Scaffold this active site. Structure first.
Site, PDB file in Angstrom:
ATOM      1  N   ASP A 140       0.941  -1.067  -0.002  1.00 25.31           N
ATOM      2  CA  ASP A 140       0.121  -0.048   0.015  1.00 25.31           C
ATOM      3  C   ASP A 140       1.029   1.146   0.083  1.00 25.31           C
ATOM      4  O   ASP A 140       0.632   2.354   0.728  1.00 25.31           O
ATOM      5  CB  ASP A 140      -0.898   0.011   1.243  1.00 25.31           C
ATOM      6  CG  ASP A 140      -2.043   0.999   1.079  1.00 25.31           C
ATOM      7  OD1 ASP A 140      -2.270   1.437   0.129  1.00 25.31           O
ATOM      8  OD2 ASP A 140      -2.899   0.937   1.990  1.00 25.31           O
ATOM      9  N   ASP A 158       3.484   2.331   7.144  1.00 24.64           N
ATOM     10  CA  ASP A 158       2.121   1.682   6.851  1.00 24.64           C
ATOM     11  C   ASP A 158       1.100   1.811   8.077  1.00 24.64           C
ATOM     12  O   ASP A 158       1.335   1.191   9.083  1.00 24.64           O
ATOM     13  CB  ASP A 158       2.187   0.309   6.441  1.00 24.64           C
ATOM     14  CG  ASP A 158       1.174  -0.452   6.010  1.00 24.64           C
ATOM     15  OD1 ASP A 158      -0.198   0.321   6.189  1.00 24.64           O
ATOM     16  OD2 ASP A 158       1.106  -1.507   5.804  1.00 24.64           O
TER      17      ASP A 158
END
Ligand SMILES: CNC(=O)c1cc(Oc2ccc(NC(=O)Nc3cc(C(C)(C)C)nn3-c3ccc4ncccc4c3)c(F)c2)ccn1
Ligand code: NA
Ligand code: NA
Length: 275
Positions: A140, A158
């Protein structure tokens, strides 16, 4: 004499009482993360918490375990944990200016000029080269998951934003959840990831940096993204973006992951970009 001796010693476990918990960070959108001050070192920290036994403990301890193995100047640094009993804490270094996405959107552009932009990207390049070395897939990568510190220090992190962000950032594709506009085509179709899918995400991040935090694929609807990419549509070069940074973006967005450069090659690209 001063060396540890007792059976339940753990070098990462810290004294909860050493930390004074201040207010929530990122106005709720970044989860249970608070500003804190590690008393004895006159040090401000970030503290991610888990109020009690929610049975979310296993997800939390695994994040802790990961962060202990990660050591790099451009990766969020773990300072300690409180994981013997609730409330559980993950204590990291504090990055003054918060996430990179909001930083870019709110900055003074004479201070955060085109040279600073290129330098921030180089810092992210180095962090992903290290993760590639550790064989760690981020999954991500995006400006919302990067942090900004003093003197334009950038660090990849993250926050687990797919369970925290409301709106049209994370949605369903072929029945799976993705940050659609940062996801490589093969990841959208097969729901599988690799270092090369992070390479695709890094090209989008490059575009986020070049545009001072614009939303990718301007105006294009989410469910339009995949079919567009399949026809070879790629985002245009941003205003004032040097050609060789734009060709790096385009290299990261090769349809075949085999044709995308490694993060090692991405960082060499920044090194040799002149003359
Ligand atoms: C104003 N300043 C601030 O607001 C501010 C806030 C701030 O808070 C934090 C930022 C990041 C983390 N956590 C992480 O970074 N985790 C991490 C990194 C990686 C990598 C190695 C994949 C990147 N994997 N995982 C990681 C691993 C497993 C996880 N499992 C589930 C959920 C998420 C996960 C994340 C944190 F706990 C607190 C720090 C500095 N400033
Ligand atoms: Na740039
Ligand atoms: Na290139």
């Amino acid at each position: 004499s001063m060396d540890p001796s007792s059976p339940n010693y753990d070098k990462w476990e810290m004294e909860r009482t050493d930390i004074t918990m201040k207010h929530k960070l990122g106005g709720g959108q970044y989860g249970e993360v608070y500003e804190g001050v590690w008393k004895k070192y006159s040090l401000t920290v970030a503290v991610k918490t888990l109020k009690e036994d929610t049975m979310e403990v296993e997800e939390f301890l695994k994040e802790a375990a990961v962060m202990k193995e990660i050591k790099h100047p451009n990766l969020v640094q773990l300072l300690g944990v409180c994981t013997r009993e609730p409330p559980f804490y993950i204590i990291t270094e504090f990055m003054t200016y918060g996430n990179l996405l909001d930083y870019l959107r709110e900055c003074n552009r004479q201070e955060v000029n085109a040279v600073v932009l290129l330098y921030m990207a180089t810092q992210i390049s180095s962090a992903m080269e290290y993760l590639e070395k550790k064989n760690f897939i981020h999954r991500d990568l995006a400006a919302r998951n990067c942090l900004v510190g003093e003197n334009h220090l950038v660090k990849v992190a993250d926050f687990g934003l797919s369970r925290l962000m409301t709106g049209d950032t994370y949605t369903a594709h072929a029945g799976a959840k993705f940050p659609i506009k940062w996801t490589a085509p093969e990841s959208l179709a097969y729901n599988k990831f690799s270092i090369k899918s992070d390479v695709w995400a890094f090209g989008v991040l490059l575009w986020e940096i070049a545009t001072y935090g614009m939303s990718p694929y301007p105006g294009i609807d989410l469910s339009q993204v995949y079919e567009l990419l399949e026809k070879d549509y790629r985002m245009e070069r941003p205003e004032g973006c040097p050609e060789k940074v734009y060709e790096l973006m385009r290299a990261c967005w090769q349809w075949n992951p085999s044709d995308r450069p490694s993060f090692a090659e991405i960082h060499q690209a920044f090194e040799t970009m002149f003359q």
